[PDB]
Structure 1
Amino acid sequence: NVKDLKASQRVCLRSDSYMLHKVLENKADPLVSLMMVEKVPDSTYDMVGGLTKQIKEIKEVIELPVKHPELFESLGIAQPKGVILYGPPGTGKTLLARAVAHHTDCKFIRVSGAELVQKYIGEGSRMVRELFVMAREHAPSIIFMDEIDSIGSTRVEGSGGGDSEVQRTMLELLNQLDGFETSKNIKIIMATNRLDILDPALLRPGRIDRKIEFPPPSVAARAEILRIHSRKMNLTRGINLRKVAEKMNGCSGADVKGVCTEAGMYALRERRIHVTQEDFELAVGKVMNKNQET
């Protein structure tokens, strides 16, 4: 029947009779042009932990709206348009985005800004317009903009105004959502540690309303991050994570993940079936050596 058929349905039609005999599944094209879904993320607040100041702030800006929309409306506060995270590089800027997405149980959608840089008439323009349509179907979502961020957790990508032009479009679209629709279920995440990727629309109220600070790790914090990474794998059981942590100073969340992986090569050479505390001290010594560079 015609209500099984729909626009953009993929169907099997007889080459014999030209009769649409069954329906498969619907197809799409931006979802395979470097945009992607990642359901139920594996990041937690304990992952890049020691985020306390941020935790309460981020919960109210993102999580409460999503969890309870009616409440925001009636209270007298419209939902925040964007959050920009600003603080030291290489922390867990990306990680945080995924963590929040998981918590509310919303779809994490990773957008490569530049990819959204086709050199044909409009094909790029097309994908940008479709990015919003898709996410409106897929609501709720965290739309995380990759390539505006310098992080050692993944990689520093982006150059030029080629992700500043894209960064602008995201902010217009939030106006547009409060605008004719009068909805908002879709929150857009900036992360940056860089001044040569900003906008003047970024600096403007009614266009982006929250600037939430990302702390530096500390000796207490490093222990929390380290603890998670060592208990996703096999380790000695008398361990003092606190001891290790005091030895790292200066060292971001991404470094706490590097310490474990460098410690592991030591374990692996000496043909152990677990890592030990020892490996971790030596690993902290290795990272400190790099920071001090001549």
Structure 2
Amino acid sequence: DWNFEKMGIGGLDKEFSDIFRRAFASRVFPPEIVEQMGCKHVKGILLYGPPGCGKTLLARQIGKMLNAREPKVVNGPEILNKYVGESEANIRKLFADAEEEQRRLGANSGLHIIIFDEIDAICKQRGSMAGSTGVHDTVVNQLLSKIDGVEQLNNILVIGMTNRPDLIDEALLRPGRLEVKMEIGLPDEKGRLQILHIHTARMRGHQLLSADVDIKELAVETKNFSGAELEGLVRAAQSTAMNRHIKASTKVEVDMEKAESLQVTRGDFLASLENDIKPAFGTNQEDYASYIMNGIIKWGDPVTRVLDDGELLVQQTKNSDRTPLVSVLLEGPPHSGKTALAAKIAEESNFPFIKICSPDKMIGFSETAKCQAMKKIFDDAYKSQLSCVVVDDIERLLDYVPIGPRFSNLVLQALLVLLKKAPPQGRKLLIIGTTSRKDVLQEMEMLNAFSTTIHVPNIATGEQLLEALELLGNFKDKERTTIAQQVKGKKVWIGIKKLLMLIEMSLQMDPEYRVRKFLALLREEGASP
């Protein structure tokens, strides 16, 4: 039987299918033919995937599916990092029961399962990439010798677990030990629909769930939701709906007046979905809501062209089969409005995964820490069906300073490789960057890595300045006429950001001196190419 909808696990049908078809087909056939052929039994499995997706449930379910003892448990950083001379004793103790049973009745016993949580720490000499590795080869050598060294056993089965699959030494994966490896992944719409159908099953049985609640629609509003957070959403909804019936006094007592009629309504689901349970591979209206701070105003031609090009790039990266990766670089003079446009372009992609790697959250970090943080941010984007990332103010990550010059050579070389890297098969990406010194990056050869570039200009005519002032709607018609009497017969040079500060400074004077001070200010800072 493979009734994988009653055991408790949902959204994983092919994974268990393959795992059984290959590994555990010998332990289900009658022992007669199994002995006649002489086929040996697998004694190792490696599951790897993102954290909080349902890896332990599968382990316990596979253990129970074949009648066996209660699975043991271990932890990675626990067995290691204890008093010397005792870790080996613990490792030897781990298999004591299996060894005793084998010595007692030989080749006729029950499976003894183990679950080696977080295996990519102790059995890892590949710790030297940017910092340093640890001298702990004793543990890995002892484990390898025990599982299969110069001796063998037939009453064991080792299941590993890890969220970093590229930190495992090949010595622990040669055929004969830890052969079958599988990858668990984030569920899609059908997976979420199945998952939401199990965690709320007892409530529906006892007519304690209102008929308005819709699961089909609830399966379309949670995008890139991990498996373990639907449980959190359901629990939050249950808590919210049941808090109305706790009206009490100095000493809290249950409101027995209407203990019945305790019904959960769609409103509570929606409330818990908007205010609480913030996703892991889903982003919020916090990161891309502090960069944009005064909206976007159309003061001329450039805004429309830039937004149109952004939309074209997005629609290319969403409907192409031969260019899974696209990049674009924004540039312009300082105080021109580069950062405030990248966020606006990215916000309208309706992309499930959005993140912003800015330099203001890394203050005082060393080189290696910054490289590792950037690498982690990039790695957290290959796991979603389609994503989008932003890298703003590049020239303050490299630490460029005109004197010297002085850059950091360990960040540029990571940035180039990561910019030219392609994601796994089937997925897509889009990278946007903003910089204010185009003449410097060209020397470093970086510009040849970016697919395309766009130019963001400043205000360069009296008409555009007047239009911006009108749209901002601050000065009256008379003052606008007075200003136009001067600005029109000349040229201007001022970025959009500086205009807000100049207007704010000017507005604080007396009512009759709000124009002269502004005009005086525009002569010193502005109109100065």
TM-score range, shorter chain: 0.5 to 0.7
| Separation of aligned partners in 2, 1:114 and 1:94 | 18
| Separation of aligned partners in 2, 1:206 and 1:284 | 47
User: Corresponding residue for 1:112?
Assistant: 75
User: Corresponding residue for 1:155?
Assistant: none
Deviation, 1:188, is: 0.9
Residue type of the alignment partner of 1:245:
A
| Separation of aligned partners in 2, 1:72 and 1:277 | 55
Q: Is the 8 A contact 1:139 1:186 kept in 2?
A: no
Residue type of the alignment partner of 1:53:
K
Residue type of the alignment partner of 2:182:
I
Residue 229 of structure 2 corresponds to residue 255 of structure 1: yes
Q: Is the 8 A contact 2:229 2:279 kept in 1?
A: no
Residue 245 of structure 2 corresponds to residue 283 of structure 1: no
Deviation, 1:263, is: 1.4
User: Corresponding residue for 2:243?
Assistant: 269
Residue 63 of structure 2 corresponds to residue 86 of structure 1: no
Identity %: 33
Structure 1 residues 133 and 118 mapped into 2: Cα distance closer, same or farther (>3 Å)?
A: same
| Separation of aligned partners in 2, 1:226 and 1:169 | 44
| Separation of aligned partners in 1, 2:164 and 2:72 | 23
Of 175, 181, 192 in structure 1, the residue corresponding to residue 162 of structure 2 is 192
Of 28, 51, 74 in structure 1, the residue corresponding to residue 12 of structure 2 is 51
| Separation of aligned partners in 2, 1:145 and 1:77 | 26
Residue 193 of structure 2 corresponds to residue 231 of structure 1: no
Alignment of 1:137-156 (within 5 A): 137=101, 139-148=110-119
User: Corresponding residue for 1:175?
Assistant: 148
Deviation, 1:143, is: 0.7
| Separation of aligned partners in 1, 2:53 and 2:14 | 15
Q: Is the 8 A contact 1:50 1:221 kept in 2?
A: yes
Q: Is the 8 A contact 1:116 1:124 kept in 2?
A: yes
Deviation, 1:56, is: 0.9
User: Corresponding residue for 1:101?
Assistant: 63
Unaligned stretches of 5+ residues in structure 2? 102-108, 121-132, 246-260, 288-529
Residue type of the alignment partner of 1:115:
E
Q: Is the 8 A contact 1:62 1:187 kept in 2?
A: no
User: Corresponding residue for 1:292?
Assistant: 283
Deviation, 1:273, is: 3.4
Deviation, 1:66, is: 3.9
Residue type of the alignment partner of 1:84:
L
Q: Is the 8 A contact 2:27 2:41 kept in 1?
A: no
Q: Secondary structure at the match of 1:94?
A: helix
Q: Is the 8 A contact 1:244 1:284 kept in 2?
A: no
Residue 89 of structure 2 corresponds to residue 126 of structure 1: yes
Bigger Rg, which one: 2
Residue type of the alignment partner of 2:146:
L
Q: What is the aligned length?
A: 240
Residue type of the alignment partner of 1:267:
A
Deviation, 1:134, is: 2.0
Structure 1 residues 243 and 190 mapped into 2: Cα distance closer, same or farther (>3 Å)?
A: same
Deviation, 1:110, is: 1.4
| Separation of aligned partners in 2, 1:232 and 1:225 | 14
Q: Is the 8 A contact 1:229 1:257 kept in 2?
A: yes
- Higher RCO structure (Cα 8 Å, ≥6 apart): 1
Q: Is the 8 A contact 2:203 2:209 kept in 1?
A: no
Residue type of the alignment partner of 1:236:
L
Residue type of the alignment partner of 2:10:
G
Which shows bigger deviation, 276-285 or 82-91? 276-285
User: Corresponding residue for 2:25?
Assistant: 64
| Separation of aligned partners in 2, 1:231 and 1:257 | 12
